Amino acid sequence: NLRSLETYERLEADKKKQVHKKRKCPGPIITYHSVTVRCSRTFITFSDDAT
Amino acid sequence: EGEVTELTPCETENPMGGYGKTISHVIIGLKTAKGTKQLKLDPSIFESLQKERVEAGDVIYIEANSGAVKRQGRCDTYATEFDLEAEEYVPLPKGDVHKKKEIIQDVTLHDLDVANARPQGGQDILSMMGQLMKPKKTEITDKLRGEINKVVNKYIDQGIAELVPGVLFVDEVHMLDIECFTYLHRALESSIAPI
Amino acid sequence: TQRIASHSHVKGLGLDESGLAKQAASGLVGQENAREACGVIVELIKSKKMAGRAVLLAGPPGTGKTALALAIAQELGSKVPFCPMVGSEVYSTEIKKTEVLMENFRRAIGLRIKETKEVYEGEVTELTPCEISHVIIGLKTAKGTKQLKLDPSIFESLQKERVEAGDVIYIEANSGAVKRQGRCDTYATEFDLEAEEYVPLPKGDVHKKKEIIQDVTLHDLDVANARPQGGQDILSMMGQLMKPKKTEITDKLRGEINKVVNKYIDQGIAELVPGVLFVDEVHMLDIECFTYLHRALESSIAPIVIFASNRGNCVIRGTEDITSPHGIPLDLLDRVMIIRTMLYTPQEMKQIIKIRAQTEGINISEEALNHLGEIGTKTTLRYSVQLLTPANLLAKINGKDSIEKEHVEEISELFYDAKSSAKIL
Amino acid sequence: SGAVKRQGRCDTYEEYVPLPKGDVHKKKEIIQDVTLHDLDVANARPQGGQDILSMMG
Amino acid sequence: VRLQRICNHPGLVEPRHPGSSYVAGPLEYPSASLILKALERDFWKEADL
Amino acid sequence: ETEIIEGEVVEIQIDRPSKVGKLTLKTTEMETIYDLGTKMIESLTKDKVQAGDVITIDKATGKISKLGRSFTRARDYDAMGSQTKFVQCPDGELQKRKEVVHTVSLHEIDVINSRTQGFLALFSGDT
Amino acid sequence: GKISKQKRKEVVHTVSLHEIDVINSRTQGFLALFSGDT
Amino acid sequence: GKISKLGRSFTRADAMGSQTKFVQCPDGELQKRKEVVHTVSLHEIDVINSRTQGFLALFSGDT
Amino acid sequence: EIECFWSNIEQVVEIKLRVELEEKRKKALNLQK
Amino acid sequence: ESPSELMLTLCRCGESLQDVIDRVAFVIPPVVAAPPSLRVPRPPPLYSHRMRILRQGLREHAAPYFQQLRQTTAPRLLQFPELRLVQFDSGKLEALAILLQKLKSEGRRVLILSQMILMLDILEMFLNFHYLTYVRIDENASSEQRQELMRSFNRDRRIFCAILSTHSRTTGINLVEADTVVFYDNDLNPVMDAKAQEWCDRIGRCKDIHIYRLVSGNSIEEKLLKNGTKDLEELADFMEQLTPIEKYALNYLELFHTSIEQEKERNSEDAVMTAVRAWEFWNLKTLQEREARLRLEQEEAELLTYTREDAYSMEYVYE
Numbered sequence A: 001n002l003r004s005l006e007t008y009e010r011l012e013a014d015k016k017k018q019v020h021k022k023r024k025c026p027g028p029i030i031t032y033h034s035v036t037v038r039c040s041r042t043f044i045t046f047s048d049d050a051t
Numbered sequence B: 001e002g003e004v005t006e007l008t009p010c011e012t013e014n015p016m017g018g019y020g021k022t023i024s025h026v027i028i029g030l031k032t033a034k035g036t037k038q039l040k041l042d043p044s045i046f047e048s049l050q051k052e053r054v055e056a057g058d059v060i061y062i063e064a065n066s067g068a069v070k071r072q073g074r075c076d077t078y079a080t081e082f083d084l085e086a087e088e089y090v091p092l093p094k095g096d097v098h099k100k101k102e103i104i105q106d107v108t109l110h111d112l113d114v115a116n117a118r119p120q121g122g123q124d125i126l127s128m129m130g131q132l133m134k135p136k137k138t139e140i141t142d143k144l145r146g147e148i149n150k151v152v153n154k155y156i157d158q159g160i161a162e163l164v165p166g167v168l169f170v171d172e173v174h175m176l177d178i179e180c181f182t183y184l185h186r187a188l189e190s191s192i193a194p195i
Numbered sequence C: 001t002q003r004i005a006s007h008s009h010v011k012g013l014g015l016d017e018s019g020l021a022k023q024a025a026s027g028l029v030g031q032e033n034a035r036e037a038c039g040v041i042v043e044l045i046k047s048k049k050m051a052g053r054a055v056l057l058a059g060p061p062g063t064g065k066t067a068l069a070l071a072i073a074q075e076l077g078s079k080v081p082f083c084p085m086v087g088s089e090v091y092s093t094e095i096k097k098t099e100v101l102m103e104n105f106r107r108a109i110g111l112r113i114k115e116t117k118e119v120y121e122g123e124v125t126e127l128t129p130c131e132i133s134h135v136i137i138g139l140k141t142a143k144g145t146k147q148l149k150l151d152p153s154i155f156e157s158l159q160k161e162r163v164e165a166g167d168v169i170y171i172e173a174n175s176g177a178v179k180r181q182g183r184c185d186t187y188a189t190e191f192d193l194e195a196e197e198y199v200p201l202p203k204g205d206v207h208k209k210k211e212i213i214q215d216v217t218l219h220d221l222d223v224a225n226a227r228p229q230g231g232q233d234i235l236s237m238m239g240q241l242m243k244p245k246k247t248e249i250t251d252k253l254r255g256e257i258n259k260v261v262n263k264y265i266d267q268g269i270a271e272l273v274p275g276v277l278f279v280d281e282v283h284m285l286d287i288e289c290f291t292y293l294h295r296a297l298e299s300s301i302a303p304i305v306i307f308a309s310n311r312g313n314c315v316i317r318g319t320e321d322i323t324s325p326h327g328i329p330l331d332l333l334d335r336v337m338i339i340r341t342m343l344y345t346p347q348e349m350k351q352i353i354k355i356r357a358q359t360e361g362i363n364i365s366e367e368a369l370n371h372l373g374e375i376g377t378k379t380t381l382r383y384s385v386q387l388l389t390p391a392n393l394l395a396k397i398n399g400k401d402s403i404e405k406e407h408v409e410e411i412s413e414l415f416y417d418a419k420s421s422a423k424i425l
Numbered sequence D: 001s002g003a004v005k006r007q008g009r010c011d012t013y014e015e016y017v018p019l020p021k022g023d024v025h026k027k028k029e030i031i032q033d034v035t036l037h038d039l040d041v042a043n044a045r046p047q048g049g050q051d052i053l054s055m056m057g
Numbered sequence E: 001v002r003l004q005r006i007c008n009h010p011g012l013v014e015p016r017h018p019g020s021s022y023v024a025g026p027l028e029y030p031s032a033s034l035i036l037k038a039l040e041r042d043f044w045k046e047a048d049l
Numbered sequence F: 001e002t003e004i005i006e007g008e009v010v011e012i013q014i015d016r017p018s019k020v021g022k023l024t025l026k027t028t029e030m031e032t033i034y035d036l037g038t039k040m041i042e043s044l045t046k047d048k049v050q051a052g053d054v055i056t057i058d059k060a061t062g063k064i065s066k067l068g069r070s071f072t073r074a075r076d077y078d079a080m081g082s083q084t085k086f087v088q089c090p091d092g093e094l095q096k097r098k099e100v101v102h103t104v105s106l107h108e109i110d111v112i113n114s115r116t117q118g119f120l121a122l123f124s125g126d127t
Numbered sequence G: 001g002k003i004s005k006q007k008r009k010e011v012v013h014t015v016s017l018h019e020i021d022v023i024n025s026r027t028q029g030f031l032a033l034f035s036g037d038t
Numbered sequence H: 001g002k003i004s005k006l007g008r009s010f011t012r013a014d015a016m017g018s019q020t021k022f023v024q025c026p027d028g029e030l031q032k033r034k035e036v037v038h039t040v041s042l043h044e045i046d047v048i049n050s051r052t053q054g055f056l057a058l059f060s061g062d063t
Numbered sequence I: 001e002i003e004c005f006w007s008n009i010e011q012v013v014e015i016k017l018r019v020e021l022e023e024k025r026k027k028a029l030n031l032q033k
Numbered sequence J: 001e002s003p004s005e006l007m008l009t010l011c012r013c014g015e016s017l018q019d020v021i022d023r024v025a026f027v028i029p030p031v032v033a034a035p036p037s038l039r040v041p042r043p044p045p046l047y048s049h050r051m052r053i054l055r056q057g058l059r060e061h062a063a064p065y066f067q068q069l070r071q072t073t074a075p076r077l078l079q080f081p082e083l084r085l086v087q088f089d090s091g092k093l094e095a096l097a098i099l100l101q102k103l104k105s106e107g108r109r110v111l112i113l114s115q116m117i118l119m120l121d122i123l124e125m126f127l128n129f130h131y132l133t134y135v136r137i138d139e140n141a142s143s144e145q146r147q148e149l150m151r152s153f154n155r156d157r158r159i160f161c162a163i164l165s166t167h168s169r170t171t172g173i174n175l176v177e178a179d180t181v182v183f184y185d186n187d188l189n190p191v192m193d194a195k196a197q198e199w200c201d202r203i204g205r206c207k208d209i210h211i212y213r214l215v216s217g218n219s220i221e222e223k224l225l226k227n228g229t230k231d232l233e234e235l236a237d238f239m240e241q242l243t244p245i246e247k248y249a250l251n252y253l254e255l256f257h258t259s260i261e262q263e264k265e266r267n268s269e270d271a272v273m274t275a276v277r278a279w280e281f282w283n284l285k286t287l288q289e290r291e292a293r294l295r296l297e298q299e300e301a302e303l304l305t306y307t308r309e310d311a312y313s314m315e316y317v318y319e
Ligand SMILES: Nc1ncnc2c1ncn2[C@@H]1O[C@H](COP(=O)(O)OP(=O)(O)OP(O)(O)=S)[C@@H](O)[C@H]1O
Pocket: C005, C006, C007, C008, C010, C027, C028, C029, C030, C031, C059, C060, C061, C062, C063, C064, C065, C066, C067, C068, C281, C308, C309, C310, C352, C382
């Protein structure tokens, strides 16, 4: 029954679903990631060894 | 400054999760006549490393602040007498890897006025069309001169600039006409005027 | 609110039905004869069939010549082109003063042209070129979707605007003008943060034809055809980079535009609204300008010209010794109808001062009004109306909402007129 | 000079050449009168549309 | 009904329209084709300068 | 009336083969994760935003203006770099609307509207 | 083969000397007959 | 690294002829040091530096 | 890659589920009509 | 080289000088004309070839700068009514701007009810002015589409406003995940007004509701208020051509389903912080170790020999 409802209409309104993106392919990719660690760091990720 | 001995990425199992090939540093070995230093750069410098045709044995300049790699050429040690390409083989940088010290240039306020009034503009339609037309002298507006005054004041406040006011020598001042003397009235009463 | 200028009080000539001037009406007092003559000239301009007719407003300074000219302008309304001009404006660094006079003549003749405007607006569903004679573009509105075959010019303007897909665009077929006014609203929800602005898709037809009336002058057509800005060919594009100097438009361009306008008038797609050219300080024109006006007023295309001069026996500029009545050559005075403005009595000056006080939102006591009228009799009308605003400022400083006589006296002492200043000189 | 001009496209195969001396190899003695001013103005600015930037001239 | 439409938005009773320029057809200047052939000068009279 | 989002960059991830990305900004009061469109990704890439940058983003144009480097992230890397001077983290909401006043003169409007690149004549006096 | 939107027909054009030398003064000198920039 | 073509080979001049010019083969060293003395005036330097293509003003006089 | 395949199948499942509920509504409407 | 700057402003002490130009650049020529054409019957071949050569050469020379050459030299033939005139033309929209900004900050969602389709178009413009996302439910929407759109609004809290017509049919849309209702106007006929009020009250069955009505002061709108009694196939054909493996996957995912979330994803946040701190310490240790190794390298005598031309040619003077 609960699988029939739509993430709303449900009395116990569970929190923060927001269904994020599924990414879905962009082939081989290069990721640029800058994060706070007081300090800031950047990590560059290569999907495969070819690139 | 130096000759690129090595370009090696530092790999890590660092990321915020992820089954990829991650690097947290780019090791650049710069070799000058004085010695060799290994620099560890932001991984983002890998883009300009191959945007510039930077390989091992190339002479490069890495702005300490800008962080922009710049391939001057190739080291002249890798230069046979049977190689015809020129403006590619630059001598090995002398001295230390880490140095460009201070460049001091003296200008007049008119030089800044002229430079900012008509930009060089040698990159596009400005280039061909403006050069093709004759570069006449223009009547620079007080707006430009006020902006130049503001910029020079900010440069002096930052300590990058020093103001050395000079002296204007008008010989044969009797050759000026009444309009010129009337203007001199207002020009001599400005806080920015010379002697 | 609106700023109060020296003529903001004039709303018309204040003439009754029969053309006789009411003593005070529409912000004008006195000059009844001149106002009646100006009413006749207003009727002349409205009649619309006479070209090259010139009138001269003659009288000492302060008598209201410019006021009467602007009253004529108010009577005509914004529909009729009223081009104000000063004699000092002919001396241009780019074009000969004859060209300036002719341009001012041409912009006093107005055209109302009904034009069919072909509009393509919609969301770009697709954009497919064909080698480069074509671009197949799909446009979506609320009404429906259509795909259109457009010229390479429109395609290449689309590339200028950088429209790709899901973009709402507005194409004017006549001018080949493309406007990328944003991306469609349906794509706002795509991302939390995107670097563009989303606009709702158009709700009308993709292809809309609209009849609009355009207000233009003959000078607009002359300038547009002498400095062409339409067309996308490279030769004209590189000419657009030149400094846009004013050029001495030839009589041939004006004749060709006259032919085009005549064709439009025949076709019923245009109506001519010839206006009036107002040259204030006409005494500033030199002999060459007046001698050209001789010919410019014979043209069947010329507008109604109004001249104003306050000079009594001035030398004609450029002649160096020739004294003519109003600084104007006699041969030109033979072509004009002279309307004379007389000096004002103390009572008319008091009325004018009260009108200016009303326009500037200043309350002035009867004592102050009488004192200011006495001052104006002694000094000039212009001096008195100038005292009103400073006097009101002093009254507000004192905390009173009206100008009393003491404030007028104070402002009179603080400031001087030309006669007092000349005395101390 | 090596300069070349295609005089026509005679639709026989829009102009075809006459036949007084209708030889392929044509040469005759030419005289052209030119003033020194013509040479000066010819050398005052580039020769026009031949060159990359003289096109904009 | 009209007053309610005006109260909702005046763009319902009269929209603001885009301001446009008047597109005037290019002026056709007619002339003889022989005019453009002026200054051509005869081949076999032009030397190599 | 502008609508800017001003915050401290605590995370930016850009995936590149159209580009994908995510950006987290925080004020003193709140933090929000933004899924980036291609235009915004390009703007950030041009302006080279990192964690620890204080930036303002125009909702209409997407213009990125960076006010400095922040209290929390602050120091940045352990690479060549340079010295450091830090600004404060913005307070309140990320999106704060706000009304800005721009002053011009009639002469400036005349010059800009006259010559299609007549703006440079406001300095050269070539109008 | 000139293209444009039932016999040979003849056309008469009277051209002034000024028109001839303005047309032939520049590549697009015929524009100067209208702008006056001759 | 500037290439200037000054002529065609001495193995033909053998049916050609155009804007081309015919030159015989250089003799001696392929690589040559050379001293060239350029005579100009201060005005010529001024007009060369006046603008990007300012050397054209030495001809037109449009300085 | 297999996860992407299963997510694509999940999208198909969700659209089919929505369409089936809509057809359930339609069938009820026709039945009561 | 020569100096240059961009810090120069014009009159404002501010932005990047293209925004300034865009702000104040609005004039359009009253008349725009294409350059006059030379109408010659059968133009000479030499002239036409010369003109063609010139045009061809000028292009392919400006080709690298053609986009720039066009951004310049392109006249402004159109000026549109700016988007701010909406919300200035109407005091209703002026008040609705404040109301919606407050509601946005407070987190509530809104559905705007207006009788006029055209005012819904104007509302679309106004909402885009404020960068507010919305969904539009009109008379022209079928019941299936009405349900689909209202359902998308219910699913997504990233779309802020629901724009709905009082003249549309509110049949099956009983649940609206919105807190407040804005009536842009009162419908003139009590039938539609009453039906809209019942729909709002239905929305008010569960949780609290805030209903807003916009009434223009000193207008007939004020008088009328407070009285007015004076009187499927796509899924199918897509399900076909679904190769065998995917039909199986359809059945499997139908019966067995999944759930990515396990209610403890927050541990990933704390786990990520722990991993980041541990990596910072590991990086610091590796850096110290590399520096120690570099110092140890420096320990050995870096120079043992020199070159021959730098040995027997005096090489230097103490000086
Ligand atoms: N009869 C009038 N009724 C009302 N205002 C008048 C009248 N005559 C003049 N004025 C005004 O008094 C002021 C001075 O007159 P102006 O017309 O501006 O100057 P002027 O004297 O007409 O200029 P000229 O060419 O030397 S006569 C202006 O504010 C006019 O509007």
